[PDB]
Amino acid sequence: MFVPSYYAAARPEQAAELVRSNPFALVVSAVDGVPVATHAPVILEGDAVEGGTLLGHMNRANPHWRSFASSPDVLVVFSGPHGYVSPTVYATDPAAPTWDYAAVHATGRVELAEDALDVVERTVAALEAPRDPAWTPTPASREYFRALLPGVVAFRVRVRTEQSMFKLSQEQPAEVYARVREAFAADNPGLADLMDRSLEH
Amino acid sequence: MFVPSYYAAARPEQAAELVRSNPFALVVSAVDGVPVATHAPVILEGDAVEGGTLLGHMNRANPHWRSFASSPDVLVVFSGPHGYVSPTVYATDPAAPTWDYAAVHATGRVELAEDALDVVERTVAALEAPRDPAWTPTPASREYFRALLPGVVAFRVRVRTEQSMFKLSQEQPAEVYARVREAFAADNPGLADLMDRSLEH
Numbered sequence A, B: 001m002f003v004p005s006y007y008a009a010a011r012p013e014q015a016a017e018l019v020r021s022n023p024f025a026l027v028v029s030a031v032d033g034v035p036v037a038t039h040a041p042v043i044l045e046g047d048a049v050e051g052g053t054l055l056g057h058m059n060r061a062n063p064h065w066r067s068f069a070s071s072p073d074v075l076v077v078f079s080g081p082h083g084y085v086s087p088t089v090y091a092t093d094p095a096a097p098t099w100d101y102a103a104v105h106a107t108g109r110v111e112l113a114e115d116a117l118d119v120v121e122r123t124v125a126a127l128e129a130p131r132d133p134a135w136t137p138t139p140a141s142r143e144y145f146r147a148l149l150p151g152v153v154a155f156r157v158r159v160r161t162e163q164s165m166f167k168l169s170q171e172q173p174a175e176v177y178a179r180v181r182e183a184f185a186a187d188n189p190g191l192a193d194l195m196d197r198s199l200e201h
């Protein structure tokens, strides 16, 4: 990922906020020069992405994790709100379309996690916390988690580098930008909200 | 990506449909064992993903494409609708949460495309076609496209292998499945629609 200057994060906490808000990530390895990717829920431990630790799990039947045992470098992609930007919205000419989005790419060394029950229980807690009502596992469900453990593989990534893209129409003049934000306010409020926070500081 | 049997596509056209419907893709290379990824619009040429050709573009200032000149194998990830599945919706116990999603992973040999204007013009046509009204470039905008060309790099992927995941609650018993579909019908109609099509044949 390349980040033009005008799409860079305005604050270092913006990257961590995106990661926490969008835990359904893409975990990517380079198995002997061939990229392999798994979609998996991944949570953040720490205040910042760079230097932080990511925790996730996948299916034991998914052979991807067997590439982790050597502890190679992996890439974890977190994707926030996104949406196609049509020049119909710009109301200007000439023009070209684009796609608006935010994402965090975290790269670091993967390792298998022995404490898989802790990882999955922390993932439940993180993903249910913003819901009302939130689901709390019954004691029977916690026993079910224990029974499921032989079929899961948990892992940690120690993040060496972080890059963040906030591609949110900052390349447009102010009158056009306002039109884009108004259009997403109806069609994609999560993206409009992200545009608003990107202008902060 | 690993695809359990009950999440496999029911029809071979399902993968192509997802690709056409979700052109904002992730292009992934293995630059000397390190995964690198760029978010870019990618369109499909052909009736099937496997054996088909993908066409995309990226920023020339993005150094990712300089890894393509040797024509390595790349992975292109197309992501359809997705959403967190809370056990609150299941109304059963014991239970564990999951994430529902659909995706197509296309792997093949990348090559730079000299015909960049054709690629970007076909991308405009594909992404505007489902809109009403659709944006058609003015002659002035087509000249603007020509003026932008030195700053863009277009590329082709010849897809050798395709895998498709339709992880859409098929592991749940029928009464629970019905509850999931009803909940997404309100919260995420694109995902509910995908659940409906997954049961076809």
Ligand code: HEM
Pocket (backbone or CB within 6 Å): A038, A039, A040, A041, A057, A058, A059, A060, A062, A120, A121, A123, A124, A127, A144, A145, A146, A148, A149, A151, A152, B002, B096, B097, B098, B099
């Ligand atoms: C918010 C909570 C959770 C989410 C979003 C989630 C999501 C997922 C996803 C997307 C996969 C597929 C990974 C792959 O393709 O390799 C998976 C696999 C798996 N997870 Fe979770 N999971 C959650 C909680 C749990 C818990 C609490 C356990 C308890 C041990 C668990 C155990 C498993 C197992 C055994 C598998 C592999 C087989 C299966 O799909 O049932 N997960 N999970």
Ligand code: HEM
Pocket (backbone or CB within 6 Å): A002, A096, A097, A098, A099, B038, B039, B040, B041, B057, B058, B059, B060, B062, B120, B121, B123, B124, B127, B144, B145, B146, B148, B149, B151, B152
């Ligand atoms: C549906 C139509 C289009 C979409 C969704 C789209 C989207 C994008 C995206 C996401 C990028 C950033 C890629 C990266 O990070 O490396 C990009 C870059 C670029 N694209 Fe497009 N594009 C479209 C049409 C066009 C057209 C018609 C042209 C005309 C030549 C063009 C020229 C460029 C150029 C010059 C760049 C790099 C600098 C810039 O961002 O302006 N694109 N495009």
Ligand SMILES: N[C@@H](CCCNO)C(=O)O
Pocket (backbone or CB within 6 Å): A095, A096, A097, A098, A099, A171, B148
């Ligand atoms: N940044 C230029 C060209 C964008 C082409 N890719 O989206 C514009 O906004 O007109």
Ligand SMILES: N[C@@H](CCCNO)C(=O)O
Pocket (backbone or CB within 6 Å): A148, B095, B096, B097, B098, B099, B171
């Ligand atoms: N497939 C099991 C466990 C799912 C855990 N990961 O989502 C269930 O649906 O209960």
